[PDB]
Design an enzyme around this catalytic site. Structure first.
Site, PDB file in Angstrom:
ATOM      1  N   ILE A  23       0.835  -1.201   0.000  1.00 15.37           N
ATOM      2  CA  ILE A  23       0.000   0.000   0.000  1.00 15.37           C
ATOM      3  C   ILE A  23       0.886   1.273   0.000  1.00 15.37           C
ATOM      4  O   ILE A  23       0.348   2.377  -0.076  1.00 15.37           O
ATOM      5  CB  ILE A  23      -1.050  -0.007   1.154  1.00 15.37           C
ATOM      6  CG1 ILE A  23      -0.408  -0.284   2.531  1.00 15.37           C
ATOM      7  CG2 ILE A  23      -2.193  -0.985   0.848  1.00 15.37           C
ATOM      8  CD1 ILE A  23      -1.209   0.209   3.712  1.00 15.37           C
ATOM      9  N   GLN A  25       2.731   4.199  -1.265  1.00 13.34           N
ATOM     10  CA  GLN A  25       2.495   5.068  -2.429  1.00 13.34           C
ATOM     11  C   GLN A  25       3.795   5.690  -2.975  1.00 13.34           C
ATOM     12  O   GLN A  25       4.445   6.473  -2.279  1.00 13.34           O
ATOM     13  CB  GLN A  25       1.483   6.182  -2.077  1.00 13.34           C
ATOM     14  CG  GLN A  25       0.116   5.673  -1.596  1.00 13.34           C
ATOM     15  CD  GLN A  25      -0.644   6.661  -0.727  1.00 13.34           C
ATOM     16  OE1 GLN A  25      -0.093   7.331   0.158  1.00 13.34           O
ATOM     17  NE2 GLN A  25      -1.955   6.705  -0.905  1.00 13.34           N
ATOM     18  N   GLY A  26       4.135   5.332  -4.220  1.00 12.24           N
ATOM     19  CA  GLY A  26       5.301   5.826  -4.950  1.00 12.24           C
ATOM     20  C   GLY A  26       6.642   5.592  -4.281  1.00 12.24           C
ATOM     21  O   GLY A  26       7.292   6.543  -3.838  1.00 12.24           O
ATOM     22  N   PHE A  27       7.360   7.769  -1.282  1.00 10.49           N
ATOM     23  CA  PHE A  27       7.236   7.323   0.105  1.00 10.49           C
ATOM     24  C   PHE A  27       7.915   5.938   0.311  1.00 10.49           C
ATOM     25  O   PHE A  27       8.528   5.413  -0.625  1.00 10.49           O
ATOM     26  CB  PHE A  27       5.760   7.301   0.538  1.00 10.49           C
ATOM     27  N   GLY A  28       7.819   5.395   1.534  1.00 10.91           N
ATOM     28  CA  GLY A  28       8.436   4.131   1.937  1.00 10.91           C
ATOM     29  C   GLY A  28       7.806   2.834   1.448  1.00 10.91           C
ATOM     30  O   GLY A  28       6.803   2.845   0.723  1.00 10.91           O
ATOM     31  N   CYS A  29       8.429   1.697   1.842  1.00 13.69           N
ATOM     32  CA  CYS A  29       8.010   0.328   1.522  1.00 13.69           C
ATOM     33  C   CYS A  29       7.058  -0.186   2.626  1.00 13.69           C
ATOM     34  O   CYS A  29       7.503  -0.563   3.710  1.00 13.69           O
ATOM     35  CB  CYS A  29       9.236  -0.565   1.357  1.00 13.69           C
ATOM     36  SG  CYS A  29       8.852  -2.296   0.991  1.00 13.69           S
ATOM     37  N   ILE A  30       5.743  -0.137   2.363  1.00 12.66           N
ATOM     38  CA  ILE A  30       4.703  -0.482   3.332  1.00 12.66           C
ATOM     39  C   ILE A  30       3.705  -1.474   2.737  1.00 12.66           C
ATOM     40  O   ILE A  30       3.213  -1.275   1.628  1.00 12.66           O
ATOM     41  CB  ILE A  30       3.983   0.814   3.851  1.00 12.66           C
ATOM     42  CG1 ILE A  30       4.986   1.839   4.436  1.00 12.66           C
ATOM     43  CG2 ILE A  30       2.888   0.494   4.882  1.00 12.66           C
ATOM     44  CD1 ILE A  30       4.629   3.292   4.204  1.00 12.66           C
ATOM     45  N   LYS A  50       6.216  -1.782   7.900  1.00  9.00           N
ATOM     46  CA  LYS A  50       7.132  -0.845   7.250  1.00  9.00           C
ATOM     47  C   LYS A  50       8.498  -1.525   7.151  1.00  9.00           C
ATOM     48  O   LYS A  50       8.990  -2.032   8.154  1.00  9.00           O
ATOM     49  CB  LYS A  50       7.217   0.484   8.022  1.00  9.00           C
ATOM     50  CG  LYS A  50       7.849   1.623   7.231  1.00  9.00           C
ATOM     51  CD  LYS A  50       7.727   2.958   7.968  1.00  9.00           C
ATOM     52  CE  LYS A  50       8.600   4.042   7.371  1.00  9.00           C
ATOM     53  NZ  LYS A  50       7.991   4.676   6.172  1.00  9.00           N
ATOM     54  N   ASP A 156       7.539  18.257  12.045  1.00  8.66           N
ATOM     55  CA  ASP A 156       7.027  18.180  10.682  1.00  8.66           C
ATOM     56  C   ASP A 156       5.518  17.867  10.648  1.00  8.66           C
ATOM     57  O   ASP A 156       5.061  17.015   9.872  1.00  8.66           O
ATOM     58  CB  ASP A 156       7.834  17.147   9.867  1.00  8.66           C
ATOM     59  CG  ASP A 156       7.835  17.374   8.368  1.00  8.66           C
ATOM     60  OD1 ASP A 156       7.197  18.346   7.911  1.00  8.66           O
ATOM     61  OD2 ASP A 156       8.470  16.581   7.652  1.00  8.66           O
TER      62      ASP A 156
HETATM   63  N1  LIG Z   1       3.062   5.309   1.469  1.00 10.05           N
HETATM   64  C1  LIG Z   1       2.741   6.285   1.976  1.00 10.05           C
HETATM   65  C2  LIG Z   1       2.565   7.537   2.736  1.00 10.05           C
HETATM   66  C3  LIG Z   1       2.672   7.183   4.217  1.00 10.05           C
HETATM   67  C4  LIG Z   1       3.982   6.798   4.602  1.00 10.05           C
HETATM   68  C5  LIG Z   1       4.281   6.438   5.920  1.00 10.05           C
HETATM   69  C6  LIG Z   1       3.284   6.447   6.884  1.00 10.05           C
HETATM   70  N2  LIG Z   1       3.686   6.021   8.173  1.00 10.05           N
HETATM   71  C7  LIG Z   1       3.072   5.359   9.179  1.00 10.05           C
HETATM   72  N3  LIG Z   1       3.448   5.282  10.422  1.00 10.05           N
HETATM   73  C8  LIG Z   1       2.707   4.569  11.400  1.00 10.05           C
HETATM   74  C9  LIG Z   1       1.512   3.933  11.058  1.00 10.05           C
HETATM   75  C10 LIG Z   1       1.120   3.989   9.705  1.00 10.05           C
HETATM   76  N4  LIG Z   1      -0.068   3.418   9.064  1.00 10.05           N
HETATM   77  C11 LIG Z   1      -0.573   3.359   7.765  1.00 10.05           C
HETATM   78  C12 LIG Z   1       0.075   3.865   6.560  1.00 10.05           C
HETATM   79  C13 LIG Z   1      -0.790   3.554   5.559  1.00 10.05           C
HETATM   80  C14 LIG Z   1      -0.723   3.790   4.114  1.00 10.05           C
HETATM   81  C15 LIG Z   1       0.125   3.388   2.986  1.00 10.05           C
HETATM   82  C16 LIG Z   1       0.103   4.813   3.436  1.00 10.05           C
HETATM   83  N5  LIG Z   1      -1.790   2.950   6.089  1.00 10.05           N
HETATM   84  N6  LIG Z   1      -1.676   2.810   7.423  1.00 10.05           N
HETATM   85  N7  LIG Z   1       1.907   4.682   8.844  1.00 10.05           N
HETATM   86  C17 LIG Z   1       1.919   6.840   6.584  1.00 10.05           C
HETATM   87  C18 LIG Z   1       1.566   7.233   5.218  1.00 10.05           C
END
Ligand SMILES: N#CCc1ccc(Nc2nccc(Nc3cc(C4CC4)[nH]n3)n2)cc1
Length: 320
Positions: A23, A25-26, A27-30, A50, A156
């Site tokens: 999921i 987007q373009g 951002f980290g490997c998630i 992540k 930020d």
């Molecule tokens: N890709 C992108 C942008 C993006 C990058 C990092 C984060 N970090 C972060 N930290 C802690 C919890 C958490 N939960 C999420 C993140 C997503 C979707 C895939 C975005 N769903 N649930 N996400 C959030 C948005």
């Protein structure tokens, strides 16, 4: 691509997790994630995984923040004691190491969220109502008080780092601690000066005067960033947005508008239509010293007066 859809990964606490669909987007490997079971990881997954290489600096900084300040029982004890409905700090569920083609990778299990506020903001013609902005800001003040009391500053805060609870669209969470800063390790506040290990200056349009001055972020800076966010959400603009390629200009406009908050209100809002709580909030943050502990309750009362003025109350309804 670090994982396969359905791959089972084990963290340092020997907890098993099943990987779902990417999921990121373009951002980290998630990827979507859940507790290991016979069933595949669905679209309704309660977790995310992540992943970054082991040598990644921001993932180590982010992991350290979550391990130190975002343990599920740590957050729940605070929610209970402070009598909050919820706390917009994402919960930490586990971390480990994973190998792919010889190389070593670090992973973190965290809460899954819904849409970010930037998407909703852009879909609402770059505007949020006074009710929405005040309700969002009350919850961000809760998040900021918590992380500040746990020796960290975000530096930020912005709509793209604010994600809604997947199950509750009235609960907003602050994400991205990859460049978070530990301003008072072991209760010792960092001196007014540059940090050689820190390179980040936040997001230019929202960043603090302290960050523009090349000083390490502190508590007053986070509150200042929120102030600029509030104006941007209410008006769809910031006075310095036409010259973001020039940080000298952005700092100059910020320093001048801090010195005369009434001219900032006149610039951003139509004559005599400025919300009084925004000016009062900016004036209170202006009075903060670099190492000073903010009076968070006083800032909340300022925003609560704004809700009373529009005939509403803190009912926790985001209306966006
Ligand atoms: N890709 C992108 C942008 C993006 C990058 C990092 C984060 N970090 C972060 N930290 C802690 C919890 C958490 N939960 C999420 C993140 C997503 C979707 C895939 C975005 N769903 N649930 N996400 C959030 C948005």
């Amino acid at each position: 691509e670090q994982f396969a859809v359905g791959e089972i990964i084990t963290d340092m606490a020997a907890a098993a997790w099943k990987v779902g669909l990417p999921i990121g987007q373009g951002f980290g490997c998630i990827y979507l994630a859940d507790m290991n079971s016979s069933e595949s990881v669905g679209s309704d997954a309660p977790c995310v995984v992540k992943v970054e290489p082991s040598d990644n600096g921001p993932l180590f900084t982010e992991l350290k923040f979550y391990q130190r300040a975002a343990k599920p029982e740590q957050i729940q004890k605070w929610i209970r004691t402070r009598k909050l409905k919820y706390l917009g700090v994402p919960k930490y569920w586990g971390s480990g190491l994973h190998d792919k083609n010889g190389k070593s990778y670090r992973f973190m299990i965290m809460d899954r969220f819904g849409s970010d506020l930037q998407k909703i903001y852009e879909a609402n013609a770059k505007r949020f109502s006074r009710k929405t902005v005040l309700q969002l800001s009350l919850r961000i003040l809760d998040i900021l008080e918590y992380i500040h009391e746990h020796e960290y500053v975000h530096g930020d805060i912005k709509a793209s780092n604010l994600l809604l609870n997947y199950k509750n669209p009235d609960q907003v969470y602050l994400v991205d601690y990859g460049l978070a800063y530990r301003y008072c390790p072991e209760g010792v506040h960092k001196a007014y000066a540059a940090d050689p290990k820190r390179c980040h200056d936040g997001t230019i349009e929202f960043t603090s005067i302290d960050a523009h001055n090349g000083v390490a972020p502190s508590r007053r800076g986070d509150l200042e960033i929120l102030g600029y966010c509030m104006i941007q959400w209410l008006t769809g603009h910031l006075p310095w947005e036409d010259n973001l390629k020039d940080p000298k200009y952005v700092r100059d406009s910020k320093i001048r508008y801090r010195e005369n908050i009434a001219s900032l209100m006149d610039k951003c809002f139509p004559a005599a239509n400025a919300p009084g709580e925004i000016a009062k909030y900016m004036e209170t943050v202006k009075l903060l010293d670099y190492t000073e502990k903010p009076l968070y309750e006083n800032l909340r009362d300022i925003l609560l007066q704004g809700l009373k003025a529009i005939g509403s109350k803190d009912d926790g309804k985001l209306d966006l």
